Amino acid sequence: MFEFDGKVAVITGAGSGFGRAFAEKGASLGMKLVLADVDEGALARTVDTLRAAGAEVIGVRTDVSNGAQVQALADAALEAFGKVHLLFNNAGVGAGGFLWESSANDWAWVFGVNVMGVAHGVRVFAPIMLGQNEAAHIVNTASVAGLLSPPSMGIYNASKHAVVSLTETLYHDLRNAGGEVGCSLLCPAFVPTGIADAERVRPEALRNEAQPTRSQLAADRQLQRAVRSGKLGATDVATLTFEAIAERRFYILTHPAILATVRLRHEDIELQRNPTDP
Amino acid sequence: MFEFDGKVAVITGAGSGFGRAFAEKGASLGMKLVLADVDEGALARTVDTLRAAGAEVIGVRTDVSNGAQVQALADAALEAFGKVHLLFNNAGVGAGGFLWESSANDWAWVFGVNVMGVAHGVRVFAPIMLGQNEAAHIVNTASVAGLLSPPSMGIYNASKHAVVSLTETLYHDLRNAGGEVGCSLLCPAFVPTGIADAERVRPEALRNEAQPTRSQLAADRQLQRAVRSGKLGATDVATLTFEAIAERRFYILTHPAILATVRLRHEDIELQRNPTDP
Amino acid sequence: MFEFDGKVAVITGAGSGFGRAFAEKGASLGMKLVLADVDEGALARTVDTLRAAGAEVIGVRTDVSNGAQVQALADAALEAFGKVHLLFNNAGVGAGGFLWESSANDWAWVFGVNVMGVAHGVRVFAPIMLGQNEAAHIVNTASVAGLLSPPSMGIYNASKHAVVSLTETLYHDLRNAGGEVGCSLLCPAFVPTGIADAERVRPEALRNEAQPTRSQLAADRQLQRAVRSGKLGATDVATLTFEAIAERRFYILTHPAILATVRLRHEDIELQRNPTDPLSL
Amino acid sequence: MFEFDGKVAVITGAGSGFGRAFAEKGASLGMKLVLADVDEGALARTVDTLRAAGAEVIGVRTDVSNGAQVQALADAALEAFGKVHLLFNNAGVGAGGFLWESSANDWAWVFGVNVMGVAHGVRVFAPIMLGQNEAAHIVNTASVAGLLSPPSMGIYNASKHAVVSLTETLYHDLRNAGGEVGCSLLCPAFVPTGIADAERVRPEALRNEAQPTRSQLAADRQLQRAVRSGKLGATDVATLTFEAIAERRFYILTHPAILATVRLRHEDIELQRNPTDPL
Amino acid sequence: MFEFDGKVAVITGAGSGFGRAFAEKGASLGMKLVLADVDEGALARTVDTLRAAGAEVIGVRTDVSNGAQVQALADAALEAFGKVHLLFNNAGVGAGGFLWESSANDWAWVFGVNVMGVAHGVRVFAPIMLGQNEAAHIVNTASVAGLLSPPSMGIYNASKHAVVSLTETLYHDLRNAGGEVGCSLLCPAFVPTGIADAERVRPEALRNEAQPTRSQLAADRQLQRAVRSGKLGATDVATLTFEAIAERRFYILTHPAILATVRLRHEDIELQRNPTDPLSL
Amino acid sequence: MFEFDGKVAVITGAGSGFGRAFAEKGASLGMKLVLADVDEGALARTVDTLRAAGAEVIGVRTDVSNGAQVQALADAALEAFGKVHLLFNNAGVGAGGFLWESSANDWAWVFGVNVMGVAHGVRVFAPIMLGQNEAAHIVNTASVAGLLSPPSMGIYNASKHAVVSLTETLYHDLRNAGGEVGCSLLCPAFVPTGIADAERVRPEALRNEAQPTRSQLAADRQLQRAVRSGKLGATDVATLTFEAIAERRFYILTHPAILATVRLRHEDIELQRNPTDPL
Ligand SMILES: NC(=O)c1ccc[n+]([C@@H]2O[C@H](COP(=O)([O-])OP(=O)(O)OC[C@H]3O[C@@H](n4cnc5c(N)ncnc54)[C@H](O)[C@@H]3O)[C@@H](O)[C@H]2O)c1
Ligand SMILES: NC(=O)c1ccc[n+]([C@@H]2O[C@H](COP(=O)([O-])OP(=O)(O)OC[C@H]3O[C@@H](n4cnc5c(N)ncnc54)[C@H](O)[C@@H]3O)[C@@H](O)[C@H]2O)c1
Ligand SMILES: NC(=O)c1ccc[n+]([C@@H]2O[C@H](COP(=O)([O-])OP(=O)(O)OC[C@H]3O[C@@H](n4cnc5c(N)ncnc54)[C@H](O)[C@@H]3O)[C@@H](O)[C@H]2O)c1
Ligand SMILES: NC(=O)c1ccc[n+]([C@@H]2O[C@H](COP(=O)([O-])OP(=O)(O)OC[C@H]3O[C@@H](n4cnc5c(N)ncnc54)[C@H](O)[C@@H]3O)[C@@H](O)[C@H]2O)c1
Ligand SMILES: NC(=O)c1ccc[n+]([C@@H]2O[C@H](COP(=O)([O-])OP(=O)(O)OC[C@H]3O[C@@H](n4cnc5c(N)ncnc54)[C@H](O)[C@@H]3O)[C@@H](O)[C@H]2O)c1
Ligand SMILES: NC(=O)c1ccc[n+]([C@@H]2O[C@H](COP(=O)([O-])OP(=O)(O)OC[C@H]3O[C@@H](n4cnc5c(N)ncnc54)[C@H](O)[C@@H]3O)[C@@H](O)[C@H]2O)c1
């Protein structure tokens, strides 16, 4: 099994939600923590909270869409603790509405965080991990939206399908390369976190000047209800994720009840049948 | 059935491969053609060839990764022919190698063309089509790599999974919106085209200064053999695609033999089983 | 076999369709190209692209219905390359509709290009080829419309039957005169080209003041549909034509499926039978 | 049964050969005659003889290659007799020799008469006939040279193949348009007429300045010999032609012996076999 | 019930762990906060974040083992808010290892914070609270180690049994003196805090020149593991503690699962039985 | 069976009360005696009387709150008799009154003797005993006040609960380390000794300048009354203690009647019930 005690975990999106939960779980297993977030206030508060729980932790404000900042995060992790054993490419954002009503900025924002942030983390940290000649593991947070295509969330859906596939490919590439570095793919259903309020960290350069359309308002309200009503919490997702890492299990479906809907989409494809609305 | 005679088709990646084949097929059905490509020479030659076959056609040099140029393409199409009835968001590029060995530029290049080009086309042309109150259809070229995750092609794979999902979502959004605009998703296996030589149109700003790694060289050689040995040609893909448009069929699998491998990946997911190499 | 590499081909109608495909095929075999067309824009693009791919090519704007301009085309050919070995009398136009509804200008236009253009080509270039004491060959583009008489195409049909018989006669005349110059007759069915848009190169002096009739409109639209949906392309016509030249075969029927209805017309004649009605389209 | 008594026939080339014989046969059937030829002296000899024998006949000098004059021929026909029921687009000329040795003027001359003269007649008279709502018929004189490609006659051959196909198409077009206007295609072999001396009516603007070549002289000598030695006369051709019109028969082959040579040509095409010389 | 909104809480050890959680809970109830700690950096961050979320709070660096500084903390409390209603004598440290291997400095350090800090708190603030004629309450943090005697923790155990009994006695003394001041005794099991890292705030004068022994290393690592893996958090301890204060309940056992082994120790004593060996960890 | 003849006992608080009685009992068992007290006059009276009766005994004035002096006590013990087999960390003091009314010096005094004196003894002597590879035993004098929390005695109570738990932990630690060193915990109720007059040995540095409060005077009067009226004597406590050492019994409750009150306190804790006043 994968051992955690005294190892180093780097966690993006650590100021909230799953990322904060991963930090708490990692601390309880004896991990040293490198926490990264673009939300300065959330990051600072999470660092202080983890320290008050006895964790050894540093924080590095990081916009994961920026390759130079992700490199800087790795450099900070090595300077502090010498090694990186666990990477959670977890930061994410969303936007909704009829697909054609979204702006170019919306596409750039969501793909910059949800895909390029994951890409940067893999590109920067996998060589470091491969060079250490020790067990290490990379966990990428997708979503059940990486296995399904629900209406009015097409940009988010597409970004999460990209994370699914790049992480599947990563699994094969790491094996073909050899070594003790593995990876997993986390695909949760809705959990009460801050994800429905992702607009709070949209960068100024990507703001929309147009007011939200009717379908965008509807999608935003829908996501809030879905998020607020999830029956598993972020703490449960952290527990299940670390169990999967210990077993080096690739697919982490925290809400396996979704599998009926996933099977439906897969059946559409195998039957070359126009997409079913369930 | 969808009628083509006298209608207007806008085709990206028209200078080669599937795009040139779509232009020839469209011309044989009586369509007016708006051809777009970033490769100036290929675009000009394709325009001349189609004209020598009696087609009514214009060409617009277009980098589909650039939203302003995709808008300009729509403006040129309307100025020439007044309407757009068929859109082929078809331009694409690729890169390969162990996932972490690829550069940030590689990610930006492939996602800029394969995802943002599709996104721009949907964003710009779907409102035009919805406003015409006539039948229209949008075809997005993914790949079987949008349904599978083969090793050493992770960036390409991820971009094509994104196209799959955004197009599935588009299908639902168009229905929820109402109207006569539909869409389809084209997922071919390997076909002898120019796709293995996509580096010919990598923009200067995204060039790699480092020489290719061992795995990148291997992946490039593998793709060339796969592409050169495909048993269906681009003309066959065009024929099958237009048949699907006529029936408004969403999933266009030109090589349905792939479905055994697709089922294998779907089984991995449904069973939460680590990815199988077939 | 007939040698192409290093030889000189003169092609009329080279801006589009078959002529352009002949030029591409000739270039791929190493021929020097003299390309002629009245559509200066199309001709310039054809020449430019062939030259950029490495051809030795000149383009000469030529109205093949004009005897002096055909003579000027031969002069430009000889001035650029010294010889002419292959001549494609290929430019052509068309018009349709009930035969009596067409104008005198329609007859003059179609026959000026389709018959007189071929006639000038033969008259000007055959003596040049005979005087060279070298293998040479003349290919005239007729049509399956030179072997059949489909309705509402009578002016075009008549011009193509004229090309058929003049070329058949040339075959015998060249053998009677003796020497190494031969000829072939190309008779394709519908192929995607610009031929249904021939009005774009009708000269202003032969324009029709009158509005087109119902039967003329119907013939135009039927021809547009038939041409654009042809299953063989201009490239295929060029490939088959050069194969025939190589073996000096006279009849080039690129679409042999036409033979059932050619046989029907022949048996009408042989039985003195009133022409069998064509099937519905 | 197409009926002739009291109907109006327009005949081109009426001063000689087939045209004169059509006129004499039409007169014997009680037709009113409108006779056209570019040769005014020969046209007058035909008209005056028929008028002396009691026919209703007018003569109109006409160059059938000139559309304006063909229109005036129709105008005179309608002015005199009110209707046109039978049209013989019959005037014709020829030239011979190795194909490439002929001049541009040779092409323009032979096609002007043999094709454009027929085209003008169809263009001018077919709408008249269609508008009359009566039985009418157009006869175009081709030749067996419209069915075969004999050597050294390429311009003539090509002109006659054009007549063959335009008349076949006219047959289909008339049926598509509907009505009682029909047509026939006359394809005779050599008959002793004046056709071998067609140069007598070559217009000045199309004169050749060069002397004839060996092959042109050879082709002229062959034609003179072949025309002189036909066993059927112009009267016989007229008899057979009106016989076929009566039955509305399209192909009029006055010399059916040539069909063996026609089958050979057709077989060449059907087999894509290099043209066989029948020797 | 005990009223919190608008009342004044003084919390020692407020920079981390339970103390920080008490301050957060007090802020959420509308209490004015006087927060004390010797870890100036941790205390400043705690105060800053609470104030930014809207608390009325002051932070006062205080070494609770120093009687004068505890008196200074009361003076700062009264100067800022005029009253003290709730006192959490909560700061604490620890050391482990075989009892005889610990130094005199180890005893002085642990007892100075864990016992004397509580003693100074009671001595300084109880008279203030009694003189106010208002409801007030003192909460002393002991531990389940004040109810049990686990091996290799004897100095810490002893200090926490001292807190237990002094607080039990204070309960009776406050009732005998009369009035509205009460007290409670908080006895948690392991919770993720900084308590296993207490060496970070050992004063320089009480440092050990000697290397740590095998049994001291083992005790430190066991404590690190037990603390970090506690299933209840500091927030939960704060929630349960304030619920107990509200009902003025004396014993606060946040981890009642400890009761089986507390009963075992009690029956050892009641039966005059040699202490039952603890189970393997 | 732990054996006493010829073994060495170190006894703190040897000038009075339990400590003097331990010394007399040890002498009767043939032990060599190392006697310590901060009161030099009382220590000399004990030492000289025992020596007169034929014991091997030395006296070492010792303030057990001072680690250096406890070390010197061990040094003198080893110098005179070579070994230490029995240690009574017995010296103790007290103070009373409402908890918050006591001074900082009261806390420092009572904990200095009652807890630090015991801690110093364990720290200094346990490694000696462990290194001897012989049977040895440490006895710490707590009180029933280490098992209960009677009102107005909070400083004393807390100090004695600390002794209880440190000695229980010592019991577990000695077994974890291995060897033949053990310990016991002596928990007597009130006995007529000098404990109610402990202020006679309060060091000058910890003097109170304030006069006593009503509750402190009340607590002093109660203690004087309770101590004077115990029915067991110091000799009896010494008898019971050596009896328990012989059996290696840990809990030494010389007054088992208090266990009803102890069960009540234990029940309070087990039920999380506000402390019951036993009245
Ligand atoms: N919560 C759910 O229901 C749900 C379901 C499935 C998947 N997910 C995914 O889980 C991941 C974690 O999100 P969450 O639910 O904890 O939401 P969250 O909002 O509570 O936390 C996400 C964090 O990412 C940070 N972040 C955003 N953009 C960033 C950037 N450019 N650089 C660095 N940090 C950035 C935010 O500031 C925030 O602290 C995301 O990838 C999300 O898409 C969430
Ligand atoms: N050929 C296959 O085996 C295969 C299989 C599955 C999917 N596909 C997809 O089919 C689509 C068509 O590719 P193809 O196989 O015809 O390859 P191709 O190389 O023959 O044609 C692709 C064309 O896209 C153009 N293009 C590239 N970047 C562009 C940009 N930024 N803007 C505009 N045009 C741009 C290229 O210049 C080229 O003409 C692509 O999306 C490709 O990923 C191909
Ligand atoms: N395309 C078919 O279906 C088809 C079938 C049978 C025969 N044909 C014959 O093939 C030949 C080539 O035509 P295509 O189909 O390639 O059509 P096209 O329109 O593509 O090419 C014919 C070219 O001839 C040129 N041309 C016309 N008049 C001219 C003149 N006076 N002088 C010089 N050039 C002139 C036109 O500009 C044009 O570029 C013609 O003779 C046509 O009748 C075509
Ligand atoms: N005689 C044969 O052996 C023979 C065989 C087959 C077909 N034909 C055809 O039969 C038709 C009749 O010829 P014929 O044999 O009676 O020859 P012919 O010379 O005896 O008579 C033809 C007449 O047409 C006239 N003509 C010539 N050019 C004219 C013009 N521009 N306008 C008006 N009239 C004009 C001539 O003056 C002459 O009177 C011709 O079309 C000829 O091609 C003749
Ligand atoms: N965490 C547990 O498992 C646990 C269990 C039972 C009891 N306790 C008790 O809980 C109390 C709070 O500790 P915690 O667990 O929150 O640990 P902690 O280390 O997170 O917090 C204790 C705080 O006390 C401060 N402190 C230490 N010495 C001080 C001094 N001289 N003056 C002022 N402040 C001082 C430290 O700086 C620290 O901020 C302590 O009394 C501890 O013994 C803790
Ligand atoms: N007597 C009781 O009722 C009673 C009950 C329970 C427990 N105890 C405990 O029994 C132990 C013995 O007390 P006692 O009852 O014999 O009282 P005691 O007064 O008769 O004797 C105690 C002796 O300890 C000495 N001493 C005090 N401070 C000292 C120091 N700093 N260093 C060295 N010696 C010092 C005193 O001088 C005195 O001689 C104490 O720990 C006391 O707390 C007594």
- Pick the closest to residue C237 from C198, C187, C196 (CA basis): C187
Half-sphere exposure of E108 (CA within 13 A, CB side): 15
List phi, psi (to 5°) of B59: -120, 145
Six-digit token string for D223: 């034609």
- Give the whole-angstrom CA distance, residue F94 versus residue F109: 8
Coil, strand or helix at E142: coil
Coil, strand or helix at C120: helix
Bridge partners, residue F60, by sequence: F36
Nearest residue on chain A to E44, judged by CA atoms?
A: A48
- Give the whole-angstrom CA distance, residue A148 versus residue A151: 10
Residues annotated within a binding site of B for NAD(+): 16, 18, 37, 63-64, 90, 160, 191, 193-194, 200
- Pick the closest to residue C108 from D115, D126, D165, D173 (CA basis): D115
CA-based radius of gyration for chain D: 18
The strand ranges marked E within E29-177 are: 32-37, 57-61, 86-89, 136-141
Residues making up chain E, counted from first to last:
281
Strands of the C136-141 sheet, one edge to the other: C57-61, C32-37, C8-12, C86-89, C136-141, C181-186, C251-252
Q: Are E126 and E182 in contact (CB under 8 A)?
A: no
Q: Are B27 and B50 in contact (CB under 8 A)?
A: yes
Measure CA E62 to chain center: 15
State the closest ligand 6 atom to the C-alpha of F37, by its place in the atom list counted from 1.
34
- Give the whole-angstrom CA distance, residue F250 versus residue F83: 23
Cβ neighbours of F233 (radius 10 Å) = 14
β D8-12/D32-37 pair status:
parallel
- Give the whole-angstrom CA distance, residue D90 versus residue D92: 6
Q: Tell me the residue type at C229.
A: S
- Give the whole-angstrom CA distance, residue A210 versus residue A102: 10
Cβ neighbours of C181 (radius 10 Å) = 26
Coil, strand or helix at E267: helix
Six-digit token string for E126: 């109880």
The residues, any chain, with a CB within 8 Å of residue F174's CB and separated by 6 or more, are F126, F181, F182, F183
Half-sphere exposure of E126 (CA within 13 A, CB side): 27
b/e code A153-183 from CB counts within 10 Å (16+ = b): bbbbbbbbbbbbbbbbbbbbbbbebebebbb
- Give the whole-angstrom CA distance, residue C122 versus residue E207: 117
Measure CA A186 to chain center: 8
Residue with tokens 């004897």: E154
- Give the whole-angstrom CA distance, residue A72 versus residue A93: 22
- Give the whole-angstrom CA distance, residue F150 versus residue F278: 9
Establish if E16 touches chain A: CB-CB under 8 angstroms: yes
Q: Are D122 and D89 in contact (CB under 8 A)?
A: yes
- Give the whole-angstrom CA distance, residue A206 versus residue A199: 11
Split into its structural domains, chain B has a count of 1
3-state helix, strand, coil in chain B (%, to 5): 55, 10, 35
- Pick the closest to residue E132 from E178, E179, E169, E81 (CA basis): E179
Helix H or strand E encompassing D129: helix D117-132
Ligand 5 binding site (Cβ under 6 Å of any ligand atom): E 12-13, 15-19, 37-39, 42, 62-65, 90-93, 113, 141, 143, 188, 190-191, 193-195, 198, 201, 227, 230
Six-digit token string for B168: 């599935």
- Give the whole-angstrom CA distance, residue F234 versus residue C13: 137
Q: Cα of C93 to ligand 3 centre, how many Å?
A: 6
Bridge partners, residue E182, by sequence: E137
Residues making up chain A, counted from first to last:
278
Q: Are C155 and C102 in contact (CB under 8 A)?
A: yes
Q: Tell me the residue type at C194.
A: G
Query: Please, where are the H alpha helices in chain A?
Result: 17-28, 40-52, 67-81, 104-111, 117-132, 154-177, 214-228, 234-247, 259-270
The strand ranges marked E within D50-188 are: 57-61, 86-89, 136-141, 181-186
CA-based radius of gyration for chain A: 18
Q: Cα of C15 to ligand 3 centre, how many Å?
A: 9
- Give the whole-angstrom CA distance, residue A213 versus residue F73: 89
- Give the whole-angstrom CA distance, residue D14 versus residue D23: 7
Helix H or strand E encompassing A87: strand A86-89
Six-digit token string for D130: 């269609």
Angle, CA F172 vertex, CA F167 and CA F176 arms, to 5°: 140
Cβ neighbours of F159 (radius 10 Å) = 35
The residues, any chain, with a CB within 8 Å of residue D47's CB and separated by 6 or more, are D14, D35, D57, D58, D59
Write the DSSP assignment of D184-197 as a string of letters. Answer: EEE-----SSSGGG
The residues, any chain, with a CB within 8 Å of residue F119's CB and separated by 6 or more, are E104, E107, E155, F166
- Chain B interface, best mutation among A165, A216, A252, A264, by max B CB count within 10 A: A165
Domain residues for the domain of B263 are 1-278
Q: Are D122 and C130 in contact (CB under 8 A)?
A: no
- Chain E interface, best mutation among F65, F138, F169, by max E CB count within 10 A: F169
- The answer for F 76-115 residues in CB contact with E (under 8 A) is 98-100, 102-104, 107-108, 111, 115
Nearest residue on chain C to B41, judged by CA atoms?
A: C49
- Give the whole-angstrom CA distance, residue E238 versus residue D118: 114
List phi, psi (to 5°) of D208: -95, 130
Q: Are D169 and D119 in contact (CB under 8 A)?
A: no
Six-digit token string for B92: 């694409």
Q: How far apart are the first and last CA of chain B?
A: 39
- Give the whole-angstrom CA distance, residue C213 versus residue C218: 9
List phi, psi (to 5°) of A12: -95, 160
Q: Are B156 and B96 in contact (CB under 8 A)?
A: yes
- Give the whole-angstrom CA distance, residue E112 versus residue E153: 16
D49/chain C closest Cα distance in angstroms: 34
The residues, any chain, with a CB within 8 Å of residue A78's CB and separated by 6 or more, are A84, A128
- Give the whole-angstrom CA distance, residue A141 versus residue A252: 9
- Give the whole-angstrom CA distance, residue D186 versus residue D17: 14
Active site residues of B: 156
β D181-186/D136-141 pair status:
parallel
Angle, CA E20 vertex, CA E17 and CA E24 arms, to 5°: 135
Measure CA F49 to chain center: 22
Residue C175, Cβ density class (10 Å: 0-12 exposed, 13-18 middle, ≥19 buried): middle
Q: Are C90 and C167 in contact (CB under 8 A)?
A: no
β D86-89/D251-252 pair status:
unpaired
Report the residue among F60, F159, F201 best suited for mutation to probe ligand 6: largest number of ligand atoms under 8 A from its CB: F201
Coil, strand or helix at E184: strand
Measure CA C6 to chain center: 24
Six-digit token string for D259: 């069909």
Nearest residue on chain B to A159, judged by CA atoms?
A: B162
- Give the whole-angstrom CA distance, residue B50 versus residue B35: 10
- Give the whole-angstrom CA distance, residue F165 versus residue E161: 7
The strand ranges marked E within chain B are: 8-12, 32-37, 57-61, 86-89, 136-141, 181-186, 251-252
Establish if D153 touches chain C: CB-CB under 8 angstroms: yes
Establish if F181 touches chain E: CB-CB under 8 angstroms: no
Residue with tokens 């026959």: C111
**C159 in a labelled binding site:** no
Residue B90, Cβ density class (10 Å: 0-12 exposed, 13-18 middle, ≥19 buried): buried
Give me the helix-helix angle, A40-52 and E40-52, nearest 10°: 130
Residue with tokens 């300065």: A40
Q: Are E213 and E111 in contact (CB under 8 A)?
A: no
Q: Tell me the residue type at F259.
A: L
Residue with tokens 């007429």: D193
- Chain E interface, best mutation among F161, F167, F185, F245, by max E CB count within 10 A: F161
The residues, any chain, with a CB within 8 Å of residue C271's CB and separated by 6 or more, are none
Find the CATH number of the domain harbouring B1: 3.40.50.720
Angle, CA F246 vertex, CA F241 and CA F248 arms, to 5°: 90
Write the DSSP assignment of D132-179 as a string of letters. Answer: HTS-EEEEEE--GGGT---TT-HHHHHHHHHHHHHHHHHHHHHHHH-S
- Give the whole-angstrom CA distance, residue E138 versus residue E126: 8
- Pick the closest to residue F277 from E258, E174, E126, E1 (CA basis): E174
- Pick the closest to residue B254 from B265, B266, B239, B269 (CA basis): B239
Measure CA E37 to chain center: 12
List phi, psi (to 5°) of C55: -75, 150
Q: Are F48 and F37 in contact (CB under 8 A)?
A: no
Handedness of CA A55, A60, A62, A66 (dihedral sign): negative
Which DSSP symbol is given to D272?
Answer: T
* Whether the CB of C39 sits within 6 Å of ligand 3: yes
- Give the whole-angstrom CA distance, residue D145 versus residue D126: 25
Give me the helix-helix angle, C214-228 and D154-177, nearest 10°: 110
Give me the helix-helix angle, F40-52 and F17-28, nearest 10°: 20
Six-digit token string for F124: 């200094």
Resolution (A): 1.8
Q: Are B129 and B181 in contact (CB under 8 A)?
A: yes
Q: How far is CA E226 from CA D261, E90, E281, in A?
A: 114, 20, 10
b/e code A191-210 from CB counts within 10 Å (16+ = b): bbbbbbebeebbeeebebee
Coil, strand or helix at E105: helix
Strands of the B32-37 sheet, one edge to the other: B57-61, B32-37, B8-12, B86-89, B136-141, B181-186, B251-252
3-state secondary structure B250-278: CEECCCHHHHHHHHHHHHHHHCCCCCCCC
Bridge partners, residue D57, by sequence: D33
Bridge partners, residue B185, by sequence: B140, B251
Q: Are F12 and F83 in contact (CB under 8 A)?
A: no
Report the residue among B10, B12, B16, B46 best suited for mutation to probe ligand 2: largest number of ligand atoms under 8 A from its CB: B16
- Give the whole-angstrom CA distance, residue A46 versus residue A55: 11
b/e code C268-280 from CB counts within 10 Å (16+ = b): bbbeeebbeeeee
Helix H or strand E encompassing C204: none
**D18 in a labelled binding site:** yes
Helix H or strand E encompassing E281: none
List phi, psi (to 5°) of C214: -55, -50
Establish if E252 touches chain A: CB-CB under 8 angstroms: no
Coil, strand or helix at D211: coil
Experimental method, per PDB record: X-ray
Q: Tell me the residue type at C272.
A: Q
In chain D, residues with a C-beta closer than 8 Å to the C-beta of C130 are: 100
Q: Tell me the residue type at B130.
A: L
Chains C and E touch (3+ CB pairs under 8 A): no
- Give the whole-angstrom CA distance, residue E198 versus residue C238: 92
Q: How far is CA F159 from CA E121, F82, F202, in A?
A: 17, 32, 16
3-state secondary structure F167-217: HHHHHHHHHHHCCCEEEEEECCCCCCCCHHHHHHHCCHHHCCCCCCCHHHH
List phi, psi (to 5°) of C60: -130, 110
Write the DSSP assignment of B89-145 as a string of letters. Answer: E-------SSGGGS-HHHHHHHHIIIIIHHHHHHHHHHHHHHHHTS-EEEEEE--GG
Q: Are B175 and B219 in contact (CB under 8 A)?
A: no
Residues making up chain D, counted from first to last:
279
- Give the whole-angstrom CA distance, residue F232 versus residue D172: 148
